[PDB]
């Protein structure tokens, strides 16, 4: 019926978007990490489906939405658990070992990382610059959770970022790769991950571009979901009264558990709340208490409004195809 | 990722093109046939797959070209027999029973008739307009058959043009439907084949001055129509021959549904409705050259907004750099 998956809606447009990305990268010569000049500020929003009928809804949802990860994260009260906030929806992402990049790229630009532009930029930073501060931060985080050979393990993580064949086409990436990536984008990344109930994953949590001053970074996050070694973007649904925000804590039975903030130094961790407020637009939302009567204020970060112009938006072209195809029923 | 139909390089743009088509149909009050205002004057050409690594040249062909029908028509010496004119290539067409329209739509607009705009336009004329003259021409052509072994036949032809389920999804179409179609387009249709569907269909319900004088060219084999488009950019003549070699002589392509007075002036009619040129070709005696008639083919002219092969071509170029 409709396209069988998003990218088919305007292939020429996708190519145009992809072709713009490597030209937006600025490569300094004073040792500052390479980074995007403008495109990191873009954000996708998904269109509403409620106006359509179940046979149609079904084909749009089977086409665009990863309903398996969406159900897993919702059923654990990790995704879409606050009544105050706008729904997020998981978009299908290719599972080829480059999905961290495909999901990040879709969240901003509605296309996956099929030219390997983000993957290469990550590997180039890891391979060709001094990474001593990234290494230190990762050592600290490694020791907060046998005999470690630091040099050998660091070299392996650099190797994992390469485009070389080893979830089979590329090596899977892990936390440090997310942290380096957010510094290339100058934009925080928040990962909502599958995780065992405390009564019984470490990739979940908040990655800040700490190698830049907050004033030089975009202050709405990219929001990804993670499950079974797979990343997806979790994009906001157009709707208020509900507000665009993502909670920065999870429920844990009758208490709350802060999302992990990754790769901090010790003094940063002491002023974590202050740091979060610099790099994100942190608001407080009242939620129902699962121990005490009434209510508890929790921190959340504001999410961006859709700003990805039509001329670079597969989702807009997709929706216009939907409308055409719809009115014929 | 190299799509199997030109339109899929940009499905959003395909929809825009299809949406333009019914609005371009003019529907007179005085009983004259409904007809396109402007869009009938568009022509698609295919891009060259040489000037690519033959390895990659071959990836595109499996993607876009109906090579089964190209080889059949070429081995029968009907398609691309003449070494003096440009090569024509058969584009893949949906075989759902609406392929006459999918092929015709693709030749002009690079999209298939998937909203049924042309198919509905045909049925509308046959079920609404009067068609007295069409039926007469059809009777005359039908009675030329030297032997006959008969009149619910006209109503069933009308029914065949409907969008009703028959079998494929739609009823297959025949010669008379081609003739009505060329008059809705005000543009000749030429069908290359080995149903005697092959030949030339002229929009004779219109004076030639109101018609577009480059043809639509289709191929036909095994109940299936495809467009035969010009391959873009050597120095061969941009024209389709109006004869074939047949047993050591040149035989004219059939011209369909003419009246007696029209038949007596067939060559003059061809010269009014087409751009006829007289070109030299090699004889069977290699010491001899012959002049034959050919009709000029149009140059590619689909504008930016609804030009689609350029979008497909851009995809190809991006993919090829990554392939080098
Ligand atoms: Cl776990
Ligand atoms: Cl976490
Ligand atoms: Cl020849
Ligand atoms: Cl011969
Ligand atoms: Cl013929
Ligand atoms: Cl001869």
Chain A residues touching B8 at Cβ < 8 A: 8, 11
Compute CA A148 distance to the chain's CA centroid, rounded to the nearest angstrom: 30
Whether residues A11 and B8 touch (CB distance < 8 A) is answered with yes
Of all ligands present, the nearest one to the C-alpha of B175 is: 5
A218: its two tokens: 């975009």
The CA distance from A221 to A188, in Å, is: 5
- CB-neighbour burial class of residue B28 (10 A; exposed 0-12, middle 13-18, buried 19+): exposed
Taking phi over 0 as left and psi of -120 to 50 as alpha, with beta for the rest, B31 belongs to left
Q: Give Cβ neighbours of residue B316 (< 8 Å, ≥ 6 apart).
A: B2, B47, B52, B60
In chain B, beta strands by DSSP E = 25-26, 35-36, 88-90, 189-193, 199-201, 216-221, 224-230, 239-241, 243-246, 249-252, 276-282, 289-296
Chain B residues touching A320 at Cβ < 8 A: 12, 15
B29: its two tokens: 């009050």
B257: its two tokens: 């549904």
- Sign (positive/negative) of CA torsion A95, A97, A99, A105? negative
Compute CA B295 distance to the chain's CA centroid, rounded to the nearest angstrom: 13
Taking phi over 0 as left and psi of -120 to 50 as alpha, with beta for the rest, B223 belongs to left
CB contact A305 to B (< 8 Å): no
Q: Measured between CB atoms, which of B11, B115, B322 is closest to A10?
A: B11
- Smallest Cα–Cα separation from B180: which of B134, B112, B140? B134
CA distances from B123 to A198, B33, B89, B107, B160 (A): 68, 12, 29, 21, 8
Is A155 part of the annotated catalytic residue set?
Answer: no
The DSSP code for A191 is: E
Contact of B188 with B195, CB cutoff 8 Å: no
The CA distance from A304 to B199, in Å, is: 62
Beta carbons within 10 angstroms of residue B65's beta carbon: 17
What is the Å distance from ligand 5's center to B242 Cα?
A: 9
Of all ligands present, the nearest one to the C-alpha of B284 is: 6
Chain B residues touching A324 at Cβ < 8 A: 15, 19
- What letters, b where the CB count within 10 A reaches 16 and e where it falls short, cover A29-60? eeeebebbeebbbbbbbbbebeebeeebeebb
Is A217 part of the annotated catalytic residue set?
Answer: no
CA closest to B322 among chain A residues: A115
A59: its two tokens: 């084909």
CB contact A310 to B (< 8 Å): no
Compute CA B194 distance to the chain's CA centroid, rounded to the nearest angstrom: 15
Of all ligands present, the nearest one to the C-alpha of B250 is: 4
Contact of B199 with B190, CB cutoff 8 Å: yes
What is the Å distance from ligand 4's center to B249 Cα?
A: 6
B26 preceded by a cis bond (ω within 30 of 0): no
Active-site residue numbers of B? 96, 99, 224
- Sign (positive/negative) of CA torsion B203, B204, B207, B209? positive
Q: Among A82, A99, A182, A217, which one carries the catalytic annotation?
A: A99
CA distances from B293 to B228, B239, B284, B290 (A): 19, 10, 17, 10
B164: its two tokens: 């009703």
DSSP B252-290: EPPBTT--HHHHTTHHHHHHHHS-EEEEEEE-SSTT-EE
What is the Å distance from ligand 2's center to A306 Cα?
A: 26
CB contact A9 to B (< 8 Å): yes
The DSSP code for B178 is: H
* Residues paired with A245 in a beta bridge: A302
Resolution as reported, in Å: 1.8
- Sign (positive/negative) of CA torsion A60, A65, A66, A72? negative
Residue in the structure block whose two tokens are 């590329």: A170
Is A99 part of the annotated catalytic residue set?
Answer: yes
Chain B residues touching A9 at Cβ < 8 A: 11-12
The CA distance from B188 to B200, in Å, is: 7
Q: Measured between CB atoms, which of B10, B115, B318 is closest to A10?
A: B10
- Sign (positive/negative) of CA torsion A38, A39, A45, A47? positive
- CB-neighbour burial class of residue A72 (10 A; exposed 0-12, middle 13-18, buried 19+): middle
What is the Å distance from ligand 4's center to B244 Cα?
A: 9
- CA torsion, points B29, B35, B37, B40, in degrees to nearest 10? 180
What is the Å distance from ligand 3's center to B281 Cα?
A: 5
Chain B residues touching A114 at Cβ < 8 A: 1
**Experimental method, per PDB record:** X-ray
Q: Among A40, A177, A211, A230, which one carries the catalytic annotation?
A: A230
Q: Among A96, A115, A252, A258, which one carries the catalytic annotation?
A: A96
The CA distance from A315 to A45, in Å, is: 8
Q: Measured between CB atoms, which of B10, B19, B322 is closest to A11?
A: B10
């Amino acid at each position: 019926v409709l396209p069988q998956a998003l990218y088919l809606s305007n292939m020429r447009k996708a190519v145009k978007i992809r072709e713009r990305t490597p030209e937006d990268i600025f490569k300094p010569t004073n040792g500052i990490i390479h980074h995007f000049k403008t495109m990191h500020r873009y954000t996708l929003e998904m269109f509403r489906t409620c106006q359509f009928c179940p046979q149609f809804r079904e084909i749009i949802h089977k086409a665009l939405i990863d309903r398996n990860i969406q159900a897993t994260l919702e059923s654990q009260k990790k995704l879409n658990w606050c009544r105050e906030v706008r729904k997020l929806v998981a978009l299908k992402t290719n599972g080829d070992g480059n999905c961290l990049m495909h999901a990040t790229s879709q969240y901003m630009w509605s296309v996956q990382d099929t030219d390997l532009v983000l993957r290469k930029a990550l590997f180039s930073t890891l391979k060709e610059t001094d990474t001593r501060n990234f290494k230190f931060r990762w050592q600290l985080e490694s020791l907060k959770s046998d005999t470690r050979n630091w040099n050998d393990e660091w070299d392996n993580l650099i190797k994992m970022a390469s485009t070389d064949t080893p979830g089979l086409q590329y090596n899977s990436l892990e936390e440090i790769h997310i942290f380096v990536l957010c510094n290339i984008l100058r934009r925080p990344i928040i990962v909502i991950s599958d995780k065992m109930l405390r009564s019984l994953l470490k990739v979940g949590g908040i990655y800040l571009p700490l190698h830049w001053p907050a004033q030089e970074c975009y202050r709405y996050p990219i929001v990804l979901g993670y499950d079974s070694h797979h990343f997806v973007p979790l994009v906001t649904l157009k709707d208020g009264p509900e507000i665009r925000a993502v909670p920065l804590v999870n429920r844990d039975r009758g208490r709350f558990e802060d999302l992990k903030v990754h790769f901090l130094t010790d003094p940063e961790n002491e002023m974590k709340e202050k740091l979060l407020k610099e790099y994100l637009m942190v608001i407080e939302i009242p939620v129902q208490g699962w121990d005490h009567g009434t209510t508890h204020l929790i921190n959340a970060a504001k999410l961006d409004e859709a700003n990805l112009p039509k001329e670079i938006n597969l989702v807009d072209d997709y929706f216009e195809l939907v409308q055409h195809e719809y009115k014929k029923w």
